[PDB]
Structures are given as C-alpha cells and as structure tokens.
Amino acid sequence: SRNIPIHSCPKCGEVLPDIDTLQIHVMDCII
Ligand SMILES: [Zn+2]
C-alpha cells in the first residue's frame, strides 16, 4: 500500500509530478 505523493511549489503553487521537475522549477522560480 504505497500512494503516489506529489510535489508542490509553495512560492506559487505549480503542480510538480516529481522532485526532479520540482527541483528545476524552484531553481528557476521567483524567490
Ligand atoms: Zn514556483
């Protein structure tokens, strides 16, 4: 029983399917 967690950017609220996509986003997101 393992769900499918999803990463979300708190700076804006972009839906990030994974950490890899989340990392690239936060790296190029408005600080
Ligand atoms: Zn963001």
Contact present, 7 and 26 (Cβ < 8 Å): no
* CA angle, 9 then 22 then 30, to 5°: 55
Helix (H) or strand (E) segment spanning residue 19:
helix 19-27
The experimental method behind these coordinates is NMR
Neighbours of ion ligand 1 (CB under 5 A): 9, 11-12, 14, 29
Cα separation, 26 vs 16, in Å, equals 10
Backbone angles phi, psi at 15, to 5 degrees: -75, 110
Cα separation, 15 vs 9, in Å, equals 7
- Give the Å distance between the CA of 16 and the centre of ligand 1: 9
Cα separation, 19 vs 8, in Å, equals 9
Amino acid at 13: G
Contact present, 12 and 21 (Cβ < 8 Å): no
Q: Which residue in the block uniquely carries the two structure tokens 């839906």?
A: 15
Q: Which residue in the block uniquely carries the two structure tokens 């950490």?
A: 19
- Give the Å distance between the CA of 3 and the centre of ligand 1: 24
- Give the Å distance between the CA of 31 and the centre of ligand 1: 8
Beta-ladder partners of 21: none
